[PDB]
Ligand binder design. Structure first.
Ligand SMILES: [Cl-]
Ligand SMILES: [Cl-]
Ligand SMILES: [Cl-]
Ligand SMILES: [Cl-]
Ligand SMILES: [Mn+2]
Length: 340
């Protein structure tokens, strides 16, 4: 039976089932005012699937110049062609190689660049914006988005959306690395998984994805979405409540000291965007500071709602295309105010 919603993270996470249900707002707002993230599944069934394929990005835009990041070590690969990234998205042997002769795990930095998404890709822009869930919150002019309505006393988000493209992390050592390191935004965000690429050549990588989800501390209902329904998993997220940000700063100041970093006692390890919380650091954050997070697996078509001020990190299990829009809900507008 088609149902309106379910719960993940043992009841701590709302999962809405129909992205276009006009009554979503009634369940959504109860959870959102309490500072929780929310998941909406099925957005991929609303989209034109041919507009979101790696092969088509390569053909249409492959000649543009870009920088990439080597996710394993943060090294910047400068001034290459965007086809150099896309033609290795799913075929491993076509990937740029590091000195060691290994195929690199790469992230495409700032593409499309700045606020250029709509100008470069007007048809993708339309397909996405017309199908975002909770549209009164998420559309540029929605009645519950204050982005277009606030004076300069508030930090207003850029015109989006923004596109997040990166390979999947592979090995046992990769389990300790992030696609996007622990950070926080002053605006709310909605992030949609539009494409998951499962590679080939070194295809038969199914078993280390399971250990990563397991060690990622993912709930039993989430492991059931793989083993029973055969959905494509994209990324492992950890999100923490905005109210826990300072305790996370205290932990990362202590661990920095232990690892011989030399930092002024007020410096902000979350704004630095230099940390990924592996299993050891998450266990410590729980035991030593009493802080619990949400572990979330974003499958193809899953929309993840991130509250303003909430520290979060992302780890791609396979190759992903994500598109994200920033917005300013009344529930969380305190987080972008420039005074007190
Ligand atoms: Cl809040
Ligand atoms: Cl387009
Ligand atoms: Cl709505
Ligand atoms: Cl990062
Ligand atoms: Mn973010």
């Amino acid at each position: 039976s088609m149902t309106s919603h379910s719960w993940l993270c043992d009841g701590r996470l709302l999962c809405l089932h129909d992205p276009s249900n006009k009554n979503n707002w009634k369940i959504f707002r109860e959870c959102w005012k309490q500072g929780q993230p929310v998941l909406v599944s099925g957005v991929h069934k609303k989209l034109k699937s041919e507009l979101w394929k790696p092969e088509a990005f390569s053909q249409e835009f492959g000649d543009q110049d870009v920088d990439l990041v080597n996710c394993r070590n943060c090294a910047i690969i400068s001034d290459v062609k965007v086809r150099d990234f896309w033609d290795g998205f799913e075929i491993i042997c076509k990937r740029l190689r590091s000195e060691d002769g290994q195929p690199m795990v790469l992230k495409l930095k700032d593409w499309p660049p700045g606020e250029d998404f709509r100008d470069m890709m007007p048809t993708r822009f339309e397909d996405l914006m017309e199908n975002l869930p909770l549209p009164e919150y998420t559309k540029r002019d929605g009645r519950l988005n204050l982005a277009s309505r606030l004076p300069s006393y508030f930090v207003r988000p850029d015109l989006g959306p923004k596109m997040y493209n990166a390979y999947g992390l592979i090995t046992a050592e990769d389990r300790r690395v992030g696609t996007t390191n622990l950070h926080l935004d002053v605006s709310d965000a909605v992030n949609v998984m539009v494409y998951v690429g499962i590679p080939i050549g070194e295809g038969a990588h199914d078993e280390e994805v399971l250990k990563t989800i397991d060690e990622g501390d993912a709930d039993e209902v989430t492991k059931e979405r793989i083993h029973d329904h055969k959905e494509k998993p994209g990324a492992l997220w950890h999100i923490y409540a905005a109210k826990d940000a300072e305790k996370i700063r205290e932990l990362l100041r202590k661990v920095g000291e232990e690892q011989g970093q030399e930092n002024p006692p007020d410096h902000d390890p979350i704004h630095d965007q230099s940390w990924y919380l592996d299993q050891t650091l998450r266990k410590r954050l729980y035991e030593e500071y009493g802080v619990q997070g949400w572990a979330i697996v974003q499958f193809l078509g899953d929309a993840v709602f991130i509250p303003a001020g909430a520290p979060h990190q992302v780890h791609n299990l396979y190759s992903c295309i994500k598109v994200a829009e920033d917005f300013v809900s009344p529930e969380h507008v305190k987080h972008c105010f420039r005074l007190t």
